[PDB]
Amino acid sequence: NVEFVRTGYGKNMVKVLHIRREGNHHHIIELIANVQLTLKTRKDYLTGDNSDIIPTDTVKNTVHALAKLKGIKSIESFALDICEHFLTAFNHVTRVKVNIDEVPWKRLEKNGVEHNHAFIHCPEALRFCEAEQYLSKTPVVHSGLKDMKVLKTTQTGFEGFLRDRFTTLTDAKDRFFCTSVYARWRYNTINVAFDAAWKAVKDTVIQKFAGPYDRGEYSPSVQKTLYDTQLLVLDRIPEVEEIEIIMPNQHYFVIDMTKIGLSNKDEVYLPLDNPSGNITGTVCRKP
Amino acid sequence: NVEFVRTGYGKNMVKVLHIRREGNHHHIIELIANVQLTLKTRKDYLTGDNSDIIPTDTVKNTVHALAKLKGIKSIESFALDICEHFLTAFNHVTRVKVNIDEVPWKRLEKNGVEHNHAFIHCPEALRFCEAEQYLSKTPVVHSGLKDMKVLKTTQTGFEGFLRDRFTTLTDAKDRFFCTSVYARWRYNTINVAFDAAWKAVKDTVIQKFAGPYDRGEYSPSVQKTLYDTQLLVLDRIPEVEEIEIIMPNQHYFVIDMTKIGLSNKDEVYLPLDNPSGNITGTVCRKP
Amino acid sequence: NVEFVRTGYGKNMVKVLHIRREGNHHHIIELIANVQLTLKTRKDYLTGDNSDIIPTDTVKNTVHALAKLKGIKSIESFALDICEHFLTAFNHVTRVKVNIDEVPWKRLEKNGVEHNHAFIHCPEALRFCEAEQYLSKTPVVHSGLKDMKVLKTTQTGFEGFLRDRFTTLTDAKDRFFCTSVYARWRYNTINVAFDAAWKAVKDTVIQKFAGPYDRGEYSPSVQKTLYDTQLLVLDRIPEVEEIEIIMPNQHYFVIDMTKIGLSNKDEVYLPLDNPSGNITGTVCRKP
Amino acid sequence: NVEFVRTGYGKNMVKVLHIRREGNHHHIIELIANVQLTLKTRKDYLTGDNSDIIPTDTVKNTVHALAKLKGIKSIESFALDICEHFLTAFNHVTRVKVNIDEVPWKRLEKNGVEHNHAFIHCPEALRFCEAEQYLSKTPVVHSGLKDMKVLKTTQTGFEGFLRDRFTTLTDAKDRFFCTSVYARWRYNTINVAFDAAWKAVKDTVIQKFAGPYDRGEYSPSVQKTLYDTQLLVLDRIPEVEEIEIIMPNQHYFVIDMTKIGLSNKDEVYLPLDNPSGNITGTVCRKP
């Protein structure tokens, strides 16, 4: 024979919007939710016995209901509520994992004035989270951002690297740096101001990336920029225990025009989709 | 036997970023361009004669070159320069059409302070344009916006429609209205303040959709909203001669939970991707 | 001040699958349909009067309904039925347009035996159609194929073209030719064997592109290959009156490796997404 | 303060096509590659020291060069060569992980003869792999298939499930089953006939999904179909050690037409993108 390494089932792509009407003032949150369950029994896989299966339509129905019953403050707490539900409202469930994405609605805003009930879509950075809980254990939550495409046109360089027989790249004291940042962090407590924690992380990444809006900040290696950002998050948000960052390097190359008799000294650039540099890192607090 | 009704060829997906730097204060524009040429001879089609063909690679080189030589003030004027170039540098080109999309870079901004050289991607709406010119004739420019996703949670209704065998819909005094607006307008002259124009059209659409940030504005049929915005655009911008608008109705339905013994008082909603209402309209000035 | 040039509304992305079970042998057709209606009255746009509006939900319901009632033999005939219905079941509808996309289900098959009820998704090319009819007029049908990606590794060249100030490209005796074909043709009668005609066009396109299967056939100009195919379709199918073809030129370049001291003698190629050649043409029968 | 958990960097989306010409017979492989390296030194993150950095542009060139130098027989073998190189041509590299996706070119074929140099795109299923190697250690290869959309119109059901407060679903003896299979397996030796292994796994999955092309095989639970496929994969291919399979449930629901006074007798269906059932599992050989 064989041996199970891992099982799970659930409903994916459960889209939902929750509204809270105050005055004429509406609060809105829309997300796409994915829930996975692990069972104590594997008779479902072994012999096709369905008697312990919560039907995927039902888990769909449950997410909708919990939205009504518990309400939705943040994507994280909702995830935690879904988790706790499947672990306490049932007995044969050993593990539940919720991954949800938030739909980036932004309240319409004419300088300081905010519309009571109109919103526009602004994918600046995309918010997501995950909450995973084992039966009778304290839950684990990750939060993160993705697709934050930022661009700086100077105060970046790359020099003094290893040259080998396959190397053709020449040194550069100045070059574009364009990325689409992805970040994912684990919390040390279930007790966090999630909305606020999130904002802080985001603001940190953009900040160490851009530096002072005046003179900028020179960055000599995206590795070092990446590490410096990690450390800054860990100081500002004590409840973050671990942080992972992915920074693609989406290239803009100066178009050489000598073969057509023009001298293009860094006016016109060719944005190149593929391929792309990729720079990663995951750091945690010394236990 | 047969007859040509229409020919064209060129290069598509020509990406470019043009930068203009004042020391540490940098200005940028990035776009994706498509250009098409029509030739006087069809010997290329009839007999495979390449004697009159301007290679697509040359069209690419040219878009690159003109970006350096002419600079890029707007995606529209860039579009007009490409049209003019191929009609005057050659004798046998009868028509040229350039369709271009702007990559929506936004200068980074915190609390009134704006970064000298850093950008974020937050597409309220995506900008695009077209310029089409025949030999020795005056060129025609269209400009437009797309993928502007907006949501209204109230101040919309839909009642008093026709019932037939297939109608199941009941009257509604109040409901969500969500759309992803697309608009395209033909200018009556090449003499336009393009940046201010495009923004003016956008702001008009958002303002008429949302209404006052105080109370909103009721709309009984999206057709009328569509029509009203058209008229409003024709008042606000004299150089616009014709305007087309497509408004999807991307649906948000109140989830019935009675089958699970809960009463959902318009709190939790189901976003439904497909299908979607589609309401279009095209209006021009009466000569 | 103003004047309508064009109006229309409807429901889009209406997905539907129809099944016809004879023995244990199931026949299936799945499509995504979008229908647009034009009304005699414009009081809906002008004054928010909905009394002539056939609700888009009803348009949705009707497409589901006609499917049961008329059944679905082809997307073209279904499109024609939708047309006929809205024109004959109402009097205030002046125009209806149905554009349909077909989901490329292919019956599962191992060694000549065909599963009675299992299917796999292998979109060699994607099929679509359009039907447009004016009140009490004879309808017009278009059919076409899209996203048919094919590649040749030889028997193509591009020499004897124009050099101008911006040309850098040299003669090429041999090169890859890769495209993603789009074709769209109008029938001169509603009386067509649609499944057979469509297949005929497709086979013509690939055959004139690729064959004979041994040594292939040299083509000196993509313009000419496109054209010869237009003539071959017009010879094989008397009911096609007009045909349009678009062929992107998706580039594969031999990677120059001399700068790293290797000689790449046309072994390793760079597939490049952007930019792309584009070659178009529309010819019709000499009336 | 802190301590590293995981570092890595490289080039992503490296596209490559390798051609091998015999007679008139051309062989082709087109793939897209991702390479990640881990270094012994962390001076790069700590202080922005680049003296140990192999530039991503170099990794791109290395990949290109290796395609020419070593050739490309399978995407797995190419992956292993890239691993091998960076670990042996250098000293400071502690780990390399390469991920490759294959572009599904299929040789064009009519009436028993196969074209010598023409291909068409039929992603029946999409192939991919991963090779990860630590310095001086034995490398690990995973391979997989994805986006295999298969559909059956009968021989599936779902009954005898667990009921709770949020359940509305009723027993169902017969229903459509549409999935888009994803499977990924680890080999216990890097010494494998990859092309055949791949193919066997693929055919096994479509095999067990459809049952006999005559009567099908009744299936009561995708968990069992899932598990059943996993064991047949492990018995037919001794070199796969662990197997992961994910199967979405892309729903096709019978359209109730009674509210418009029709009986839709399991003829017409609504395909639903969202939400989707999801059933996963990972089983391995017991050590």
PDB file of C-alpha atoms in Angstrom, chain B residues 2-216:
ATOM      1  CA  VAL B   2     -13.508  38.941 -56.830  1.00  0.00           C
ATOM      2  CA  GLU B   3     -12.883  42.467 -55.510  1.00  0.00           C
ATOM      3  CA  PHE B   4     -10.945  43.991 -52.555  1.00  0.00           C
ATOM      4  CA  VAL B   5     -13.183  45.785 -50.101  1.00  0.00           C
ATOM      5  CA  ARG B   6     -10.477  46.468 -47.516  1.00  0.00           C
ATOM      6  CA  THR B   7      -6.723  45.903 -46.732  1.00  0.00           C
ATOM      7  CA  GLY B   8      -4.228  46.818 -44.019  1.00  0.00           C
ATOM      8  CA  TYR B   9      -1.061  45.721 -42.244  1.00  0.00           C
ATOM      9  CA  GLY B  10       1.354  46.974 -39.586  1.00  0.00           C
ATOM     10  CA  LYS B  11       2.795  46.264 -36.134  1.00  0.00           C
ATOM     11  CA  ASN B  12       0.748  45.795 -32.948  1.00  0.00           C
ATOM     12  CA  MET B  13       1.663  45.886 -29.248  1.00  0.00           C
ATOM     13  CA  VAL B  14       4.483  48.388 -29.639  1.00  0.00           C
ATOM     14  CA  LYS B  15       5.337  49.306 -26.017  1.00  0.00           C
ATOM     15  CA  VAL B  16       7.180  52.506 -25.127  1.00  0.00           C
ATOM     16  CA  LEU B  17       7.910  54.766 -22.203  1.00  0.00           C
ATOM     17  CA  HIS B  18       9.054  58.318 -22.796  1.00  0.00           C
ATOM     18  CA  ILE B  19      10.647  60.267 -19.968  1.00  0.00           C
ATOM     19  CA  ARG B  20      11.317  63.990 -19.514  1.00  0.00           C
ATOM     20  CA  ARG B  21      13.608  64.807 -16.546  1.00  0.00           C
ATOM     21  CA  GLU B  22      14.099  68.192 -14.786  1.00  0.00           C
ATOM     22  CA  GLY B  23      17.008  67.180 -12.541  1.00  0.00           C
ATOM     23  CA  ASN B  24      15.419  65.050  -9.844  1.00  0.00           C
ATOM     24  CA  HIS B  25      11.835  65.900 -10.952  1.00  0.00           C
ATOM     25  CA  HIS B  26      10.871  63.292 -13.592  1.00  0.00           C
ATOM     26  CA  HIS B  27       7.785  63.134 -15.858  1.00  0.00           C
ATOM     27  CA  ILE B  28       6.799  59.899 -17.680  1.00  0.00           C
ATOM     28  CA  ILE B  29       4.315  58.390 -20.118  1.00  0.00           C
ATOM     29  CA  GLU B  30       4.071  54.671 -21.079  1.00  0.00           C
ATOM     30  CA  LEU B  31       1.875  53.384 -23.907  1.00  0.00           C
ATOM     31  CA  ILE B  32       1.108  50.399 -26.129  1.00  0.00           C
ATOM     32  CA  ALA B  33       0.683  51.208 -29.782  1.00  0.00           C
ATOM     33  CA  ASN B  34      -0.739  49.554 -32.857  1.00  0.00           C
ATOM     34  CA  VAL B  35      -0.313  51.067 -36.312  1.00  0.00           C
ATOM     35  CA  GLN B  36      -1.871  50.017 -39.616  1.00  0.00           C
ATOM     36  CA  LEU B  37      -1.031  51.052 -43.157  1.00  0.00           C
ATOM     37  CA  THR B  38      -3.022  50.641 -46.385  1.00  0.00           C
ATOM     38  CA  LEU B  39      -1.114  50.498 -49.662  1.00  0.00           C
ATOM     39  CA  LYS B  40      -1.946  51.765 -53.166  1.00  0.00           C
ATOM     40  CA  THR B  41      -0.565  48.565 -54.695  1.00  0.00           C
ATOM     41  CA  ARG B  42      -1.927  45.174 -53.807  1.00  0.00           C
ATOM     42  CA  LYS B  43       0.845  43.431 -55.743  1.00  0.00           C
ATOM     43  CA  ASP B  44       1.814  42.011 -52.345  1.00  0.00           C
ATOM     44  CA  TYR B  45      -1.581  40.271 -52.166  1.00  0.00           C
ATOM     45  CA  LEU B  46      -2.040  39.433 -55.870  1.00  0.00           C
ATOM     46  CA  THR B  47       1.426  38.110 -56.716  1.00  0.00           C
ATOM     47  CA  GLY B  48       3.501  38.098 -53.494  1.00  0.00           C
ATOM     48  CA  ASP B  49       5.498  41.135 -54.554  1.00  0.00           C
ATOM     49  CA  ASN B  50       7.255  42.745 -51.603  1.00  0.00           C
ATOM     50  CA  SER B  51       8.562  45.737 -53.524  1.00  0.00           C
ATOM     51  CA  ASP B  52       6.201  48.235 -51.843  1.00  0.00           C
ATOM     52  CA  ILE B  53       6.117  46.726 -48.357  1.00  0.00           C
ATOM     53  CA  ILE B  54       7.353  48.815 -45.441  1.00  0.00           C
ATOM     54  CA  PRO B  55       8.438  46.038 -43.027  1.00  0.00           C
ATOM     55  CA  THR B  56       6.528  45.829 -39.754  1.00  0.00           C
ATOM     56  CA  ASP B  57       9.907  45.965 -38.025  1.00  0.00           C
ATOM     57  CA  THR B  58      10.333  49.367 -39.622  1.00  0.00           C
ATOM     58  CA  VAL B  59       6.952  50.502 -38.293  1.00  0.00           C
ATOM     59  CA  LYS B  60       8.194  49.436 -34.877  1.00  0.00           C
ATOM     60  CA  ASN B  61      11.520  51.253 -35.320  1.00  0.00           C
ATOM     61  CA  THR B  62       9.584  54.316 -36.401  1.00  0.00           C
ATOM     62  CA  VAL B  63       7.282  54.375 -33.387  1.00  0.00           C
ATOM     63  CA  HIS B  64      10.437  54.163 -31.277  1.00  0.00           C
ATOM     64  CA  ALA B  65      12.144  56.872 -33.308  1.00  0.00           C
ATOM     65  CA  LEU B  66       9.261  59.339 -33.328  1.00  0.00           C
ATOM     66  CA  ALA B  67       9.048  58.948 -29.530  1.00  0.00           C
ATOM     67  CA  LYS B  68      12.604  60.268 -29.363  1.00  0.00           C
ATOM     68  CA  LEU B  69      12.341  62.850 -32.165  1.00  0.00           C
ATOM     69  CA  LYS B  70       8.874  64.181 -31.344  1.00  0.00           C
ATOM     70  CA  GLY B  71       8.564  63.389 -27.642  1.00  0.00           C
ATOM     71  CA  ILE B  72       5.181  62.319 -26.337  1.00  0.00           C
ATOM     72  CA  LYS B  73       2.848  65.058 -25.157  1.00  0.00           C
ATOM     73  CA  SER B  74      -0.259  62.848 -25.137  1.00  0.00           C
ATOM     74  CA  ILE B  75      -1.128  59.458 -26.627  1.00  0.00           C
ATOM     75  CA  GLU B  76      -3.294  61.393 -29.135  1.00  0.00           C
ATOM     76  CA  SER B  77      -0.635  63.781 -30.522  1.00  0.00           C
ATOM     77  CA  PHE B  78       1.796  60.856 -30.729  1.00  0.00           C
ATOM     78  CA  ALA B  79      -0.908  59.089 -32.725  1.00  0.00           C
ATOM     79  CA  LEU B  80      -1.252  62.045 -35.080  1.00  0.00           C
ATOM     80  CA  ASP B  81       2.530  62.217 -35.623  1.00  0.00           C
ATOM     81  CA  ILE B  82       2.668  58.595 -36.689  1.00  0.00           C
ATOM     82  CA  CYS B  83      -0.239  59.128 -39.152  1.00  0.00           C
ATOM     83  CA  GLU B  84       1.425  62.207 -40.654  1.00  0.00           C
ATOM     84  CA  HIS B  85       4.820  60.518 -40.889  1.00  0.00           C
ATOM     85  CA  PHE B  86       3.716  57.499 -43.022  1.00  0.00           C
ATOM     86  CA  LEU B  87       1.549  59.637 -45.326  1.00  0.00           C
ATOM     87  CA  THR B  88       4.277  62.163 -46.092  1.00  0.00           C
ATOM     88  CA  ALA B  89       7.499  60.083 -46.004  1.00  0.00           C
ATOM     89  CA  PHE B  90       5.950  57.812 -48.585  1.00  0.00           C
ATOM     90  CA  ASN B  91       3.935  58.192 -51.757  1.00  0.00           C
ATOM     91  CA  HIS B  92       2.179  54.848 -51.957  1.00  0.00           C
ATOM     92  CA  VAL B  93       0.490  54.781 -48.527  1.00  0.00           C
ATOM     93  CA  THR B  94      -3.185  55.651 -48.824  1.00  0.00           C
ATOM     94  CA  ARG B  95      -4.356  55.437 -45.213  1.00  0.00           C
ATOM     95  CA  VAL B  96      -2.873  54.956 -41.759  1.00  0.00           C
ATOM     96  CA  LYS B  97      -4.616  54.035 -38.506  1.00  0.00           C
ATOM     97  CA  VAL B  98      -3.013  54.063 -35.036  1.00  0.00           C
ATOM     98  CA  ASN B  99      -4.735  52.722 -31.946  1.00  0.00           C
ATOM     99  CA  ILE B 100      -3.039  53.340 -28.646  1.00  0.00           C
ATOM    100  CA  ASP B 101      -3.545  52.535 -24.914  1.00  0.00           C
ATOM    101  CA  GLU B 102      -1.946  54.473 -22.066  1.00  0.00           C
ATOM    102  CA  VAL B 103      -0.436  52.562 -19.163  1.00  0.00           C
ATOM    103  CA  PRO B 104      -2.016  54.447 -16.234  1.00  0.00           C
ATOM    104  CA  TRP B 105       0.911  55.607 -14.081  1.00  0.00           C
ATOM    105  CA  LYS B 106      -0.001  57.832 -11.118  1.00  0.00           C
ATOM    106  CA  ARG B 107       2.630  59.914  -9.337  1.00  0.00           C
ATOM    107  CA  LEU B 108       2.999  58.772  -5.717  1.00  0.00           C
ATOM    108  CA  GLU B 109       1.237  61.156  -3.324  1.00  0.00           C
ATOM    109  CA  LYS B 110       1.033  61.447   0.431  1.00  0.00           C
ATOM    110  CA  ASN B 111      -0.722  64.324   2.200  1.00  0.00           C
ATOM    111  CA  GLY B 112      -0.191  66.897  -0.525  1.00  0.00           C
ATOM    112  CA  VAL B 113       3.423  65.907  -1.000  1.00  0.00           C
ATOM    113  CA  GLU B 114       4.194  64.388  -4.439  1.00  0.00           C
ATOM    114  CA  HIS B 115       7.258  62.192  -5.143  1.00  0.00           C
ATOM    115  CA  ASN B 116       9.881  63.431  -7.630  1.00  0.00           C
ATOM    116  CA  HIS B 117      10.390  60.041  -9.302  1.00  0.00           C
ATOM    117  CA  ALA B 118       8.129  57.251  -7.916  1.00  0.00           C
ATOM    118  CA  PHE B 119       4.897  55.878  -9.356  1.00  0.00           C
ATOM    119  CA  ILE B 120       2.040  53.582  -8.394  1.00  0.00           C
ATOM    120  CA  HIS B 121      -0.514  51.829 -10.594  1.00  0.00           C
ATOM    121  CA  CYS B 122      -4.058  52.829  -9.592  1.00  0.00           C
ATOM    122  CA  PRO B 123      -6.232  52.752 -12.711  1.00  0.00           C
ATOM    123  CA  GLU B 124      -9.474  54.660 -12.070  1.00  0.00           C
ATOM    124  CA  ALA B 125     -10.077  54.306 -15.800  1.00  0.00           C
ATOM    125  CA  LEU B 126      -7.773  53.233 -18.685  1.00  0.00           C
ATOM    126  CA  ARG B 127      -7.106  55.821 -21.341  1.00  0.00           C
ATOM    127  CA  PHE B 128      -7.104  55.146 -25.058  1.00  0.00           C
ATOM    128  CA  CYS B 129      -7.319  56.776 -28.471  1.00  0.00           C
ATOM    129  CA  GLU B 130      -7.302  56.324 -32.242  1.00  0.00           C
ATOM    130  CA  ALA B 131      -6.232  58.529 -35.112  1.00  0.00           C
ATOM    131  CA  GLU B 132      -7.185  57.585 -38.651  1.00  0.00           C
ATOM    132  CA  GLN B 133      -6.029  59.499 -41.700  1.00  0.00           C
ATOM    133  CA  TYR B 134      -6.444  59.131 -45.463  1.00  0.00           C
ATOM    134  CA  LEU B 135      -3.889  60.606 -47.934  1.00  0.00           C
ATOM    135  CA  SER B 136      -4.215  64.405 -48.263  1.00  0.00           C
ATOM    136  CA  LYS B 137      -7.443  64.296 -46.215  1.00  0.00           C
ATOM    137  CA  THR B 138      -7.802  65.691 -42.675  1.00  0.00           C
ATOM    138  CA  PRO B 139      -7.131  63.169 -39.885  1.00  0.00           C
ATOM    139  CA  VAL B 140      -9.868  62.006 -37.511  1.00  0.00           C
ATOM    140  CA  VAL B 141      -9.251  61.380 -33.824  1.00  0.00           C
ATOM    141  CA  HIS B 142     -11.264  59.298 -31.387  1.00  0.00           C
ATOM    142  CA  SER B 143     -10.457  59.244 -27.672  1.00  0.00           C
ATOM    143  CA  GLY B 144     -12.086  57.211 -24.964  1.00  0.00           C
ATOM    144  CA  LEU B 145     -12.052  55.543 -21.578  1.00  0.00           C
ATOM    145  CA  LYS B 146     -12.623  51.944 -20.484  1.00  0.00           C
ATOM    146  CA  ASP B 147     -12.793  49.544 -17.549  1.00  0.00           C
ATOM    147  CA  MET B 148     -14.050  52.184 -15.122  1.00  0.00           C
ATOM    148  CA  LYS B 149     -15.693  50.010 -12.521  1.00  0.00           C
ATOM    149  CA  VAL B 150     -18.142  51.926 -10.256  1.00  0.00           C
ATOM    150  CA  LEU B 151     -20.747  50.795  -7.736  1.00  0.00           C
ATOM    151  CA  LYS B 152     -23.871  52.435  -6.339  1.00  0.00           C
ATOM    152  CA  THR B 153     -25.630  50.767  -3.351  1.00  0.00           C
ATOM    153  CA  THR B 154     -28.872  52.711  -3.554  1.00  0.00           C
ATOM    154  CA  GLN B 155     -30.617  55.562  -5.434  1.00  0.00           C
ATOM    155  CA  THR B 156     -31.352  53.287  -8.402  1.00  0.00           C
ATOM    156  CA  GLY B 157     -34.527  51.530  -9.427  1.00  0.00           C
ATOM    157  CA  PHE B 158     -36.248  49.602 -12.194  1.00  0.00           C
ATOM    158  CA  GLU B 159     -40.053  49.495 -12.464  1.00  0.00           C
ATOM    159  CA  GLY B 160     -42.814  49.716 -15.057  1.00  0.00           C
ATOM    160  CA  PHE B 161     -41.325  47.455 -17.697  1.00  0.00           C
ATOM    161  CA  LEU B 162     -43.097  45.247 -20.239  1.00  0.00           C
ATOM    162  CA  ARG B 163     -44.236  41.780 -19.177  1.00  0.00           C
ATOM    163  CA  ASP B 164     -44.331  38.840 -21.649  1.00  0.00           C
ATOM    164  CA  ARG B 165     -44.380  35.022 -21.371  1.00  0.00           C
ATOM    165  CA  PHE B 166     -40.796  35.102 -20.290  1.00  0.00           C
ATOM    166  CA  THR B 167     -40.709  37.900 -17.748  1.00  0.00           C
ATOM    167  CA  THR B 168     -40.085  36.874 -14.119  1.00  0.00           C
ATOM    168  CA  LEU B 169     -38.685  40.145 -12.838  1.00  0.00           C
ATOM    169  CA  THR B 170     -40.627  42.108 -10.273  1.00  0.00           C
ATOM    170  CA  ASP B 171     -40.678  45.853  -9.846  1.00  0.00           C
ATOM    171  CA  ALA B 172     -37.884  47.405  -7.761  1.00  0.00           C
ATOM    172  CA  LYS B 173     -37.816  50.834  -6.095  1.00  0.00           C
ATOM    173  CA  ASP B 174     -34.245  50.386  -4.797  1.00  0.00           C
ATOM    174  CA  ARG B 175     -31.263  48.320  -5.973  1.00  0.00           C
ATOM    175  CA  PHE B 176     -27.528  48.201  -6.575  1.00  0.00           C
ATOM    176  CA  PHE B 177     -26.131  49.560  -9.864  1.00  0.00           C
ATOM    177  CA  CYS B 178     -22.635  48.424 -10.745  1.00  0.00           C
ATOM    178  CA  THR B 179     -20.960  49.022 -14.039  1.00  0.00           C
ATOM    179  CA  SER B 180     -17.708  49.056 -15.859  1.00  0.00           C
ATOM    180  CA  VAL B 181     -18.089  52.031 -18.181  1.00  0.00           C
ATOM    181  CA  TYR B 182     -16.696  52.259 -21.719  1.00  0.00           C
ATOM    182  CA  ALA B 183     -16.951  55.471 -23.742  1.00  0.00           C
ATOM    183  CA  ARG B 184     -15.699  56.581 -27.155  1.00  0.00           C
ATOM    184  CA  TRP B 185     -15.971  59.989 -28.747  1.00  0.00           C
ATOM    185  CA  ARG B 186     -15.033  61.522 -32.110  1.00  0.00           C
ATOM    186  CA  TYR B 187     -13.519  64.968 -32.090  1.00  0.00           C
ATOM    187  CA  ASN B 188     -14.645  67.447 -34.723  1.00  0.00           C
ATOM    188  CA  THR B 189     -11.237  69.140 -34.764  1.00  0.00           C
ATOM    189  CA  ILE B 190      -7.560  68.255 -34.151  1.00  0.00           C
ATOM    190  CA  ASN B 191      -7.305  71.349 -31.987  1.00  0.00           C
ATOM    191  CA  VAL B 192      -8.030  70.050 -28.497  1.00  0.00           C
ATOM    192  CA  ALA B 193      -6.519  70.230 -25.034  1.00  0.00           C
ATOM    193  CA  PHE B 194      -6.368  66.435 -24.810  1.00  0.00           C
ATOM    194  CA  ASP B 195      -5.405  65.838 -21.139  1.00  0.00           C
ATOM    195  CA  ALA B 196      -7.990  68.260 -19.839  1.00  0.00           C
ATOM    196  CA  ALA B 197     -10.593  66.843 -22.204  1.00  0.00           C
ATOM    197  CA  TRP B 198     -10.181  63.206 -21.291  1.00  0.00           C
ATOM    198  CA  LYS B 199     -10.308  64.094 -17.583  1.00  0.00           C
ATOM    199  CA  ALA B 200     -13.374  66.255 -18.161  1.00  0.00           C
ATOM    200  CA  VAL B 201     -15.256  63.400 -19.830  1.00  0.00           C
ATOM    201  CA  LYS B 202     -14.281  60.985 -17.034  1.00  0.00           C
ATOM    202  CA  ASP B 203     -15.295  63.360 -14.238  1.00  0.00           C
ATOM    203  CA  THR B 204     -18.629  63.992 -15.987  1.00  0.00           C
ATOM    204  CA  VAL B 205     -19.394  60.279 -16.129  1.00  0.00           C
ATOM    205  CA  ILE B 206     -18.473  59.692 -12.470  1.00  0.00           C
ATOM    206  CA  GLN B 207     -20.350  62.777 -11.279  1.00  0.00           C
ATOM    207  CA  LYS B 208     -23.586  61.888 -13.113  1.00  0.00           C
ATOM    208  CA  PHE B 209     -23.349  58.285 -11.935  1.00  0.00           C
ATOM    209  CA  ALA B 210     -22.825  59.104  -8.290  1.00  0.00           C
ATOM    210  CA  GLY B 211     -24.599  62.445  -7.908  1.00  0.00           C
ATOM    211  CA  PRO B 212     -24.048  64.711  -4.867  1.00  0.00           C
ATOM    212  CA  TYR B 213     -21.864  63.135  -2.153  1.00  0.00           C
ATOM    213  CA  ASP B 214     -24.525  64.276   0.232  1.00  0.00           C
ATOM    214  CA  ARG B 215     -27.667  62.543  -1.012  1.00  0.00           C
ATOM    215  CA  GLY B 216     -26.871  60.939  -4.395  1.00  0.00           C
TER     216      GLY B 216
END
